[PDB]
Amino acid sequence: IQTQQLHAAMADTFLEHMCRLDIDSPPITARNTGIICTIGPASRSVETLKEMIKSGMNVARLNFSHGTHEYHAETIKNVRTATESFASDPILYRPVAVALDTKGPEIRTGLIKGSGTAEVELKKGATLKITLDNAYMEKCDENILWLDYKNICKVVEVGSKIYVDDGLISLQVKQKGADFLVTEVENGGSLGSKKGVNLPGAAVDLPAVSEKDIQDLKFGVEQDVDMVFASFIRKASDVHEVRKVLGEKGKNIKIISKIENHEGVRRFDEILEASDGIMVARGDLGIEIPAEKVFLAQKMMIGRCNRAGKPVICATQMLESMIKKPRPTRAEGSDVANAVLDGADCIMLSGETAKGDYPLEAVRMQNLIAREAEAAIYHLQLFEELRRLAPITSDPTEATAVGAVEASFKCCSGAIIVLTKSGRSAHQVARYRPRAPIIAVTRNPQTARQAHLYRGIFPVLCKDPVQEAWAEDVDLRVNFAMNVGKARGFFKKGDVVIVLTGWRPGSGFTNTMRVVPVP
Amino acid sequence: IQTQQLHAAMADTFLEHMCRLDIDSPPITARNTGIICTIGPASRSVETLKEMIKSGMNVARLNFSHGTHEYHAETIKNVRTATESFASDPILYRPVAVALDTKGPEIRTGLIKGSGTAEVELKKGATLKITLDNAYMEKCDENILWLDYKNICKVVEVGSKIYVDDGLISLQVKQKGADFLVTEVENGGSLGSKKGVNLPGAAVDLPAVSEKDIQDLKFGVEQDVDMVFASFIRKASDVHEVRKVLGEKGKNIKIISKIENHEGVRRFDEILEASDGIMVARGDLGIEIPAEKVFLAQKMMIGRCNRAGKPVICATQMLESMIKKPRPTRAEGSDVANAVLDGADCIMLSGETAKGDYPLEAVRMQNLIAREAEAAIYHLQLFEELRRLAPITSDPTEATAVGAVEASFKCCSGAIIVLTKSGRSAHQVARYRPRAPIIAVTRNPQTARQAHLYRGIFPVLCKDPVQEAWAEDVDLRVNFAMNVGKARGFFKKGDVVIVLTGWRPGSGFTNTMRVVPVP
Amino acid sequence: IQTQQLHAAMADTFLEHMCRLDIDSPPITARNTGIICTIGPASRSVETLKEMIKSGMNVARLNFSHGTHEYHAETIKNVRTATESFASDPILYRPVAVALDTKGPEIRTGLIKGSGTAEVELKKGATLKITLDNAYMEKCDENILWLDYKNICKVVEVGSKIYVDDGLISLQVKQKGADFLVTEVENGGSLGSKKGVNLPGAAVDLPAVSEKDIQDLKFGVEQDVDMVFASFIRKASDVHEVRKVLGEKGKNIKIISKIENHEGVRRFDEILEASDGIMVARGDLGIEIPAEKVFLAQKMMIGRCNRAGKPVICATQMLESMIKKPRPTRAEGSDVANAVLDGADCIMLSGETAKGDYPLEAVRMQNLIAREAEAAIYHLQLFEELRRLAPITSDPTEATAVGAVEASFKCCSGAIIVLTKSGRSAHQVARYRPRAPIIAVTRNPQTARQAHLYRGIFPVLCKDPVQEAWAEDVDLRVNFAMNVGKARGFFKKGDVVIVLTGWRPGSGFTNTMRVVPVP
């Protein structure tokens, strides 16, 4: 009894909703939340990379704060290879996007005791001198630590904190030298080569779009990447600089700004406006601002993105435990579920799938949790608030989209099939968060790939040739969707589905909503 | 600034809604609430009857508790004559329904001092003997009063109250005779011939469907009347008896039960179930139950009807003052507005248009008020509760209807055009109470006439011949609606409208919703 | 600008609420969510145990699935010693509760290769024979594994899964022997001595209250423990058995049932009824039911407990990372915040403070997060739903409690001071979740200790002697509270506070609510 938390989504109060969550109430088979996997050593093999797709991966993240263009291009080459191995059946084929995550303006240390993987070790109380003297860039040890950020002494003050290697090792500025800093270890631990360095509450003047970044960005264009995750986006101008760089050749590449610092949070509205999406980069944010305040920023950002109808990604450490274990911790499971309940379009994995010993189990665990959570969403209230907070508009497609969602809730439809060239029609259906999956049928493969950034949209790439009889070309595509659905288990023959189409070819003419039974 | 109370319908709380009602905020030109006018001496002239239609009349009520079949048939004949005078332009033509209101089981007195219009006069304290002795049926005076209800002494007790002529004259049962009753006048006033008599809290055994009623009902069928207003409906069986009488030949005649007594109110759910609609007959109800409790019964009945999606009429004394004056009282204006706000499909006039000296002003006053009130409805909350309280269903037309309404609210559409044979598709749109007018296009004239019983539906009768190309026959009708709309001032060229259609000819296939711009 | 998320708790919609969470909006200094710390090797030292209290600990959990009575009595002795070291100032004194967590019916393995801390290692595919033959209880290795549960072969089937050491190592029943089982390792890893064993979807007949449990429970009474956390509570009868055991001598010891398995979840209502509180024991639950479904059970249990007004504890792995690191992962921070937002009375730590290398940092991290989260609660909606879902009652204290909370919201009071003997009066204020801290003043120390189980209640133990003038005895206590408040930073001199008192000594006479300014 009870499917996809029906008894619960049909309750008057949120509290009653909660009281009704049933672990014995199976969820639907469809999974709306996109899963971005950072690709690395543990997941670079075309062989295992096919298992990544099978398991759930939708977007492949290339962390460009590491690796050479020659390396990534091979990663990219492998992704596409594994991806296409399924293209021999347009029905079962699952598009996969490629995202380039810029290095941006980050600070890192040099090499430890010369050796490649040598690791010194600081101790509470011990002192450490930070040098900018390049002579030591490959001679880092318990007393001298080198950094890239050379303009450092001019932005950091006496009494400041410096964190290294994901804020695990903290230091305090005792004395500000000329080309160096005399700190004092607040908490030790071992220190490896080239690690991350955060300067909380310090105006780091590094370039929004560095030299190397422009290189990587132009490489992304040449590599035909679907999206770019810009790191350390502080203001709107920063987003604009990335637009310019991508320029005309890549005007269609979505720029997902990453909020990793305090300025980014303050100037969020400004950034969200100039971006296509947002990523709540918790890793750096958890070091830049006190950890206890991160869920506030996450919830705030996810909420404002839902209001704006722009994609939002919740990333970093969602399943860290799994880098070394086959099972995630109770807190990690709880974390994922809440990101979905918070209303995030995509959840992410980094170390979990880049170097961990259980990449496939991590990805699989996210498919599972997001599916359970998506069902626990309180649609009754969410739909209501979204419609209310939604601006007044006279755009036929906008009205058609809301109508489709309302209609879908009314008949518990198996899905909302949408024909789209650019994806916009399907985006609009998504911004109203229906419970049914949004099967977006398209012939444009870039839009099919980029579609994963949206909650609910299940991209489907039509390969069939255009019929001369537009009416039958449309009906053909609607059937394509109808089959994908039947095959993936979203719905059966008798079931009812909502179909969105337009009155003439081209974009921006969606305006037809039909409640159709499955063939 | 502000149209049709937009500022107000867009407020978070009801209280804020009220605070925003603007008398300087003009309403749309369309009027959703049907207006039923009781036709009589003051409005029987084809010449004036055309002005009734112009002014706003949608349904013509024939009070069959008076007049001869020969008389009514002529009334009917005149209505249709005045009505068809406009048929020479399908676009400007306004359908008009004919309703037969049964006499039912009513009690009336005999003739005063023989004379036709003679009027005696009782006095508080004075005694009055009620006789069943037929010898006096034309000899009524200050001492002997005759009644039709002969089984009276067997149902009335000592101490009971008897009201005469719309509860204006009250009497009390002092002594129960064998064939008479010795009362005492509680409040006097004059007493004319054949007046109404109520026996509050008394189980009058009169027949739900009397002899004469069966005659009148069968006459209704032969006269091809759209609806029947059954008087004093006490239980479901009563409604059933009227169904049977109308039988197969008139199975398509809508039976609007009238709640006029205490039993009717108690067994309401039972009655509403077996009926097509309900009429809150306040006149008799105001005598049968204490006046202060009428608004409770009205609001209760109207609310339950909205929940059930069945038509509800608020009738009697809405504009009495106007029987003799050109202006209505503040209370009457207030009464009409609240009936609309209460959510009644139709408002009614009786004496105001049957014998009053300003029938046209009364009808015009209702077009005016209803329009103002319709705009003051708090749709935000109404729509919400209707959808919640609405049962779960998998009927495609139902889903399509809700979708259309949601869509209409999203783009402030000028209308919701609906193609329907039986009326059902348009009914469903109406039960969800959209702000826009529901232009229902049909070729069946009976359904066009009966449609007035529903809030929002604006019937439009298509006279064009069926095209062989169904697609074009549909498009033709949608354009018919599009023109009626343009001509009645509902919308202009650029405006957007919602259009409801189906996928194949025949009833029950509506499932297509399109946001279309006006040609 | 903005304090304790005021701008946010004052928004019409939840979505708007979220959009307003400000990381730059400091929270009040008071922290409502109780913190239960499991005491062990890393936190048993009276010296460090004083730092546990300073850092935030409110309740000390004794995990009786380990250690000897002699050991625990010493832990208890140390807790009280550290606790009382502050009693020399009733104002700054912070009560601390002692909770006994039963071993209950658990299954564990024997010893590895004889050696105390020796660890074998299974491998996927490899086979393992499970023996009940006591000869091997201290000879466990890669081929023979021993178990306590001897009736095992009779409840497990062929094809079943067996998990060992927090579901990290899984096994599958290939062949069911007579006194043994021939399994196959699904996922390896190392295997230590005496580890946990779960038999998902298997009806383990072990005793609700085992032999050892009765011993421990009686020991708890003799030790004067405030509460008992009953493990693996499956039905109401189980709770009853624990009541009986504690019997008359310990009728005042609160029984917090722990839901660790599937039956417990199904029969929750039954258990919640018979218990004083509930603990969502995620560890075992996460093994007993699929991990992805835990947040469903957690949110469900927490919600139903808030509805019932009984304490609920969210426990296990909330900050695992911190067992070895000074910083928690983003997921763990997110986990804690959501448990508070979910509406849990208490958060807990186990390995984090029993054996971890940073117990104090773990406890401190919870004080911090819970405070931030408590401020992000959406009171506007929570209060509303709690009041609506709250049964109708004529109990003066109940009405007085609601009135106090409403009043507190109206004037942004610094606190709600409540005089209570049993605690009940303060409980009732807590079940309505006010934003302000509930300073409960009492002379009964057991009730001051047990009060931590409730969200918002800040226990304060009055040591002053009873005045003969009851009126002044009361006024004295209210002032005691008034000072505690001023010292802890809850409120200043000018501030306003809500005060709850009664009209006569004894319990159940609270009925007086006063809005008083701080002396």
Ligand SMILES: O=P(O)(O)OC[C@H]1O[C@](O)(COP(=O)(O)O)[C@@H](O)[C@@H]1O
């Ligand atoms: O690309 P968009 O803006 O989402 O619009 C989707 C479009 O695809 C259609 O359904 C079919 O159009 P095409 O044949 O050009 O692909 C249109 O009716 C509609 O305008």
Ligand SMILES: O=P(O)(O)OC[C@H]1O[C@](O)(COP(=O)(O)O)[C@@H](O)[C@@H]1O
């Ligand atoms: O009469 P209903 O039940 O309201 O249905 C309206 C019907 O009219 C249409 O719009 C047109 O049908 P017709 O050509 O038969 O009149 C259908 O698609 C739809 O089924």
Ligand SMILES: O=P(O)(O)OC[C@H]1O[C@](O)(COP(=O)(O)O)[C@@H](O)[C@@H]1O
């Ligand atoms: O113990 P309870 O049931 O919470 O009631 C609190 C009681 O404490 C008082 O505030 C003060 O009474 P005492 O002096 O006996 O402690 C009473 O008025 C009230 O009845």
Ligand SMILES: O=C([O-])C(=O)[O-]
């Ligand atoms: O880049 C990231 O994912 C981060 O900084 O958290």
Ligand SMILES: O=C([O-])C(=O)[O-]
């Ligand atoms: O018949 C009526 O209109 C009444 O009784 O109110």
Ligand SMILES: O=C([O-])C(=O)[O-]
């Ligand atoms: O007992 C516990 O806390 C558990 O099992 O998770």
Ligand SMILES: [K+]
């Ligand atoms: K990066």
Ligand SMILES: [K+]
């Ligand atoms: K009548």
Ligand SMILES: [K+]
């Ligand atoms: K235990």
Ligand SMILES: [Mg+2]
């Ligand atoms: Mg980063």
Ligand SMILES: [Mg+2]
């Ligand atoms: Mg009447």
Ligand SMILES: [Mg+2]
């Ligand atoms: Mg346990």
